[model samples]
Target: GVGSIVSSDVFNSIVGGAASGCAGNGFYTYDSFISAANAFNGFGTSGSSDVNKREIAAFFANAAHETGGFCYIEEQNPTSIYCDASNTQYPCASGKTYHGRGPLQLSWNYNYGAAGSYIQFDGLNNPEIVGTDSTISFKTAVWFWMVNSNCHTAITSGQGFGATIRAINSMECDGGNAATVASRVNYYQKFCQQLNVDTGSNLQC
Candidate 1:
């Protein structure tokens, strides 16, 4: 189970000082993360110990990057409302903003709508819960990992951390932002070492 692999001590070490004097302070609890992982049966338990640890490391690496090591619950700056009117299936709400939120910084009206349906939250009307509720926040991140993003399959299948990065945010792949890609890789590498696992091949996208 995720709890067995990623104990409180392991989680604490991975996110050093992340839950201190920040938006996520006292909000991103280790218990919340494990509880959220329970919703997905085979998240970090579907493979060998090394594979499982690598997946967990990849997940935290991307999540830590998105939230600044769990410092910020929502996107730092807002340039747009992140509402895509073109998405007819999940139309944007009148007064709601779908700016990045949670550990993975979920964005887009469509994504919120879909995630809310699966995760049982009114994403269109009450997206703030994602940033406010630690359990829900972690759930949203895990949900994205198993659903919206192909990160889970990418990592477990040996596509490596680069594939997971591309799955999360394609813009960071290729030559889009080598610096940011390197940053994510650095986290993944460090995390892998901490978990006593190899960082794997194809470190970059």
Candidate 2:
């Protein structure tokens, strides 16, 4: 847990076989996995970067919610339009598409294309690489979080749980309404309790 462990087994196990099921794939090195995890956790930076642990934890927790803990892969209908057929690289329902890949569940052509541009990946067509290519998917997720100015930057800056949750709500959930506020507060409280934090009034995001 402290370092990294890679290989097809680790990759498949981490994302629940989502990555390994893709054909012609192989194992990743431990160093590479750590590099990818740190990049994803830090939004493209290495562990030496100044990202906080709470932010990283929150991001992964959100990922668990988004991708069904990585168990919900494979191209499905309506529920995941982004992975629909008509796609060239990983054809929709061709059982090769890439919609919600990686820990962050990074999707959408715009994001995939942009990440491809920055990272020199062929994600525009081969969106499957986001899931099939472990390092790429991980890096893309981090990049999406770090570069998206609209996301909650305060989290990475150690803004505490409530403020961070507010930032997330404002950015992704439309606004901090009462329902959203309560749900986010509950989430923060749970996470803080898991981390053994004081929870304080900071739980009411």
Computed on alpha carbons, the lDDT of every model, listed in order, comes to 0.87, 0.50
Q: What is the lDDT of residue 57 in candidate 2?
A: 44
Candidate 1 lDDT over 38-70, as tens digits, reads: 888779888999999999999999988898877
The 10-residue segment with the lowest total lDDT in model 1? 17-26
lDDT of 2 by residue, 40-137 (tens): 44342333222343554455444444444444433334365465334455333334344656645666665566677776786656777776666776
The Cα RMSD of model 1 versus the native structure comes to 1.4
| TM-scores for every predicted model | 0.95, 0.57
Would you list the clashing residue pairs of candidate 1? Answer: none
Q: Cα RMSDs of all predictions? A: 1.4, 7.2
What count of clashes does model 2 give?
Answer: 2
lDDT of 2 at 26: 37
Instruction: Please give the TM-score that candidate 2 achieves against the real structure.
Output: 0.57
Query: Against the hidden true structure, what lDDT does model 2 obtain?
Result: 0.50
